[PDB]
Amino acid sequence: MKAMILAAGKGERMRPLTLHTPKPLVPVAGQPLIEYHLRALAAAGVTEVVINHAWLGQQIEDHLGDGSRFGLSIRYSPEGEPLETGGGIFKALPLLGDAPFLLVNGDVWTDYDFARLQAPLQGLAHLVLVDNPGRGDFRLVGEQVVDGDDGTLTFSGISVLHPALFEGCQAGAFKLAPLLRQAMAAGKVSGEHYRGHWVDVGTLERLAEAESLIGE
Numbered sequence: 001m002k003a004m005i006l007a008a009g010k011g012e013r014m015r016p017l018t019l020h021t022p023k024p025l026v027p028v029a030g031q032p033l034i035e036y037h038l039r040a041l042a043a044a045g046v047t048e049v050v051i052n053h054a055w056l057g058q059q060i061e062d063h064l065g066d067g068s069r070f071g072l073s074i075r076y077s078p079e080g081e082p083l084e085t086g087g088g089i090f091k092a093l094p095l096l097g098d099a100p101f102l103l104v105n106g107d108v109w110t111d112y113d114f115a116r117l118q119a120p121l122q123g124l125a126h127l128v129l130v131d132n133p134g135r136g137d138f139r140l141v142g143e144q145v146v147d148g149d150d151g152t153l154t155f156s157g158i159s160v161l162h163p164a165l166f167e168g169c170q171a172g173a174f175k176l177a178p179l180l181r182q183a184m185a186a187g188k189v190s191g192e193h194y195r196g197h198w199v200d201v202g203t204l205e206r207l208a209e210a211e212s213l214i215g216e
């Protein structure tokens with residue numbers, strides 16, 4: 001299937017790095033964060049990728065271009081207003097079309113093997129969950145994801161989404177989580193618990209951890 005990489009974040013918590021460099025282009029062990037995803041996606045057999053952007057967006061396009069160096073075809077979804085994760089995905093849906101797509105949070109660094117998500121999957125959404133880095137986000141019972149409360153897990157920012165998840169939505173800014181929680185209540189969200197390496201690189205301290213973990 002196709003993949004979307006979320007890359008529109010302003011990365012205020014990573015200043016001053018993100019003053020002239022958008023977060024997805026920040027180097028982790030010599031390589032831009034987002035290029036780990038592109039190489040892994042290409043290795044997993046993905047050939048078409050959509051990348052949304054806002055803050056310093058044109059630098060992302062200039063650096064990556066059409067993606068041919070990665071064996072990929074990249075299309076961009078520019079945002080001129082903050083749309084959040086849900087609104088950003090919605091704006092990009094015409095580029096993704098009607099079929100389920102892989103969704104990856106650009107800020108994440110992870111070992112996770114994207115080719116795993118090509119296996120037969122469950123629901124309007126299939127979420128990869130990780131140990132809390134914390135009250136967590138969600139709970140996993142067997143393969144079914146439910147809302148968190150008391151052994152909770154954290155959403156990794158890695159998932160497969162069905163465009164139908166967004167049926168009825170209106171253009172504009174809105175968050176993804178509330179939509180997932182609405183699908184969970186309908187029993188349409190499956191998931192899995194990944195126990196390997198995963199870091200949400202939102203701060204210089206997270207950058208370091210990723211650096212350290214990549215040292216193995």
Ligand SMILES: CC(=O)N[C@H]1[C@@H](OP(=O)(O)O)O[C@H](CO)[C@@H](O)[C@@H]1O[C@H](C)C(=O)O
Pocket residue numbers: 085105107137154155156157158176177200202
């Ligand atoms: C959309 C998404 O990937 N949300 C995840 C992302 O959020 P981020 O830190 O990038 O803002 O990483 C967090 C863990 O660090 C999760 O709790 C987030 O999922 C929760 C459900 C959320 O969106 O509120």
